Amino acid sequence: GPNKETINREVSILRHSYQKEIQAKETMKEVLSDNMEVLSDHIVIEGLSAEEIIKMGETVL
Amino acid sequence: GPNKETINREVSILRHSYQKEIQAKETMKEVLSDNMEVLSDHIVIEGLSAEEIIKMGETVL
Amino acid sequence: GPNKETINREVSILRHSYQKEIQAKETMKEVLSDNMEVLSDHIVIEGLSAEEIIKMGETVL
Amino acid sequence: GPNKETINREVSILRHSYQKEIQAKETMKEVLSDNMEVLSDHIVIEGLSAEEIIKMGETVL
Numbered sequence A, B, C, D: 001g002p003n004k005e006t007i008n009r010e011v012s013i014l015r016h017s018y019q020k021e022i023q024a025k026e027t028m029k030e031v032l033s034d035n036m037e038v039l040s041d042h043i044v045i046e047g048l049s050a051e052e053i054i055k056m057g058e059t060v061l
Helices: A004-042 A050-059 B004-042 B050-059 C004-042 C050-059 D004-042 D050-059
Strands: none
Touching (some): A004 C004, A004 D004, A004 D050
């Protein structure tokens, strides 16, 4: 019924799949790197403290 | 022909594959937890209403 | 080893992982919505044209 | 037990699940595109130096 060319056809694209998964973590990684450098840039300071800004985000959105 | 070692292989990576997935929603929920943090950081401000601001630039980009 | 139960395990988890994937596409579109807003938000205006600054940083990084 | 059909669903939704993984890469490459513009556009200069705000961000952030 089955055929060695079938079990392999699966196990084949099977390894290729995992690949995309690990390559993924490599992408989402570069992202957070960006989201991170950002928070640092807009991290207000002096004259205004992120806390005061939150105070405006605590009363009402 | 087919060999119990080959079905087990694909089934082995299978379990590992799911792992990456769940650990994916984890790093994902983080990417947003940050993105939102920055958004809710500025938030609408009297005088510097982030909302009103956006409008001003929506009239003529 | 070869037992319709083992291939069914790979197929059953398949639909499960699939769901997570499509759903992921949903959380992805979100990352953009939060991005376009984060961009159209800080987009400075009146005083410093996002173009003038952007260009200035173009001459050199 | 072994049904060349039950495999077809598997080996078929297989080549499919793939087209998804690479698809998500399409949305991902999209995110970065906006992620970059976001940072590259807010790159503040003259008055506030990201280098300074980066120094405080190096203290422990």
